[PDB]
Design a protein around this ligand. Structure first.
Ligand SMILES: CC(=O)N[C@@H]1[C@@H](O)[C@H](O[C@@H]2O[C@H](CO)[C@@H](O)[C@H](O)[C@H]2NC(C)=O)[C@@H](CO)O[C@H]1O
Ligand SMILES: [Ca+2]
Ligand SMILES: [Mg+2]
Length: 530
């Protein structure tokens, strides 16, 4: 039988949790593989909808509602019928327990109402032509099971009944689990892989010893010096790194320390921090060349230059280029002056400070980026120190607002809104299920206003106008310190499977991570070799 070895997420121990709503604590093979989406939007190919459990959808002229047609004939793994009842339940379950809202769907969807057993109506809070894409982010679970659960917020869901390709838990240990074919998969005819095989891997250099040895099939991890280390080991060791999203230093505007708050909330300081960075050095050393300098103050990218008001970009490009002497003289003009003879600048109010910059434990490319930056900042007089907390701790720090500076990447969408909304909408700053991305706690009502209006109408210019509005607010306020535009790291082995997505066959985002819904479409193209 065919076993496909994947690695979507680092773990030190496998805890049996297949609750699709508990993304900070669950296993990362639950979404897509156990709970198939209504639609998969192909973000690499202009958000083209690929219909799965939903047949079709249509907005109204109002842009105030949308109806999804559920596909008939679909079965859960326990034989029960997949219906609009299940879709309508799940959107209620998120609606009444918003700690399960991980994308901010509650903000968009006023309520979920059902026409027939295969038609669901969504009533909107605001005009949004992109709301089918938001809707698809939400997990759909069997109401036939989840209804008499007393607390879905803490349900570990260890014995899952799903709609997706791999719902059977064949094996489970703390260091390995095997996830096998749903006996009743609606698309079973299209599926040629038997099982997902998921080994426990704690960090990048434990990973490195496995993948160089050919033990993996499908991965998306950072691999140091990949050409001499991984490529050279076998002719069947392959990779393809299509361009991905923004990576940036995020500063905490609500830091509880008087001294650090004084520095981090100062735009001259954020700018001097940014000019101290050598972006192109970080790319070549920390990532071995795998990226592109991002000198947009707005974080826009390079990939979305068509979207760019290049009058906004030019006015602040200097504050996002390597200029160590510029950094020093900006610190001096601002009044960040070393008054205690340590060589490190102090706040205007006279207090000494050091910036603690965090990146997740085991994310060695990020870890090296931060330590590089620590050195770069020391040269211009800013004292910082690198920290590498466990991802859960790194994550909690940001949601709670206890961190100083954090290095993070963002997801890369079909347009600039996936980055800008996730990184800057202040609505996404409260809520226990919220991701870390907007957690700098900078708030600007007018920024949120443009963001939510990005899809209020259907003409290209007005949208593009609204983009230039957003780019302008962000860049002049230097809210974050953008560094580079990264790569969708992706490695695949043709030893045991064929049909892989690659540069010759670029069917979509190729990664195995949770939050890349195209990974369902990807596994459906895979079949064994001999
Ligand atoms: C947008 C986002 O937050 N993506 C996360 C990924 O970065 C992350 O993958 C990890 O990325 C690190 C930084 O480049 C790598 O060093 C690390 O090897 C890699 N880990 C894996 C398992 O691929 C994944 C998984 O942690 O989470 C994404 O949400
Ligand atoms: Ca197929
Ligand atoms: Mg000093």
């Amino acid at each position: 039988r065919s076993e496909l070895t994947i690695h979507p997420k680092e773990f030190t121990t496998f805890v049996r949790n297949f609750n699709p709503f508990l993304g900070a604590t669950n296993l990362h093979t639950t979404t897509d593989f156990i709970y198939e989406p209504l639609v998969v939007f192909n973000e690499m190919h202009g958000n083209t909808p690929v219909f799965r459990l939903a047949e079709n959808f249509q907005m109204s002229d109002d842009l105030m509602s949308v109806t999804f047609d559920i596909r008939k004939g679909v079965k859960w793994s326990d034989g029960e019928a997949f219906t609009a009842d299940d879709v309508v339940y799940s959107f209620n379950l998120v609606k009444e327990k918003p700690e399960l809202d991980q994308s901010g769907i509650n903000s968009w969807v006023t309520g979920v109402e059902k026409v027939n057993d295969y038609q669901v109506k969504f009533r909107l809070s605001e005009a949004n032509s992109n709301v089918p894409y938001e809707i698809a982010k939400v997990p759909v679970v069997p109401k036939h099971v989840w209804s008499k659960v007393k607390d879905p917020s803490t349900f570990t869901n260890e014995n899952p009944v799903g709609s997706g390709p791999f719902t059977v838990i064949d094996t489970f240990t703390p260091q390995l689990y095997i996830q096998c074919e749903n006996p009743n998969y609606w698309d079973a005819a299209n599926l040629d892989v038997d099982c997902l095989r998921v080994p426990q891997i704690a960090n990048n250099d434990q990973f490195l010893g496995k993948v160089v040895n050919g033990e993996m099939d499908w991965t998306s991890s950072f691999v140091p010096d990949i050409d001499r280390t991984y490529a050279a080991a076998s002719p069947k060791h392959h990779y393809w790194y299509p361009p991905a999203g923004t990576q940036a230093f995020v500063v905490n505007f609500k830091n509880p320390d008087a001294a650090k708050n004084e520095a981090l909330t100062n735009v001259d300081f954020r700018r001097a921090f940014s000019m101290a960075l050598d972006r192109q050095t970080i790319i070549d050393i920390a990532f071995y060349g795998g990226g592109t300098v991002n000198d947009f103050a707005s974080g826009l990218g390079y990939a979305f230059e068509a979207w760019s008001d290049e009058k906004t970009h030019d006015k602040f490009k200097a504050y996002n280029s390597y200029n160590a002497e510029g950094a020093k003289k900006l610190l001096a003009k601002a009044g960040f002056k070393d008054v205690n003879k340590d060589g490190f600048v102090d706040t205007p109010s006279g207090k000494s400070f050091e910036l603690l910059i965090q990146s997740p434990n085991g994310w060695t490319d990020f870890n090296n980026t931060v330590q590089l930056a620590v050195e770069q900042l020391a040269e211009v007089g800013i004292k910082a120190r690198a920290r590498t907390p466990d991802f859960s701790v790194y994550n909690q720090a940001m949601l709670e607002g206890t961190y100083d500076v954090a290095y993070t990447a963002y997801f890369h969408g079909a347009d600039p809104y996936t980055y800008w909304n996730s990184a800057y909408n202040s609505a996404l700053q409260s809520g226990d299920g919220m991701p870390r991305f907007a957690m700098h706690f900078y708030k600007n009502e007018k920024l949120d206003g443009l963001l939510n209006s990005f899809y209020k109408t259907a003409d290209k210019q007005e949208q593009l106008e609204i983009a230039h509005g957003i780019q302008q607010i962000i860049a002049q306020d230097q809210v974050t310190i953008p560094v580079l535009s990264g790569a969708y790291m992706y490695q695949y082995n043709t030893t045991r499977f064929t049909g892989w997505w690659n540069e010759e066959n670029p069917k979509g985002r190729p990664n195995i991570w949770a939050g890349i819904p195209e990974r369902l479409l990807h596994v459906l193209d895979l079949k064994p070799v001999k």
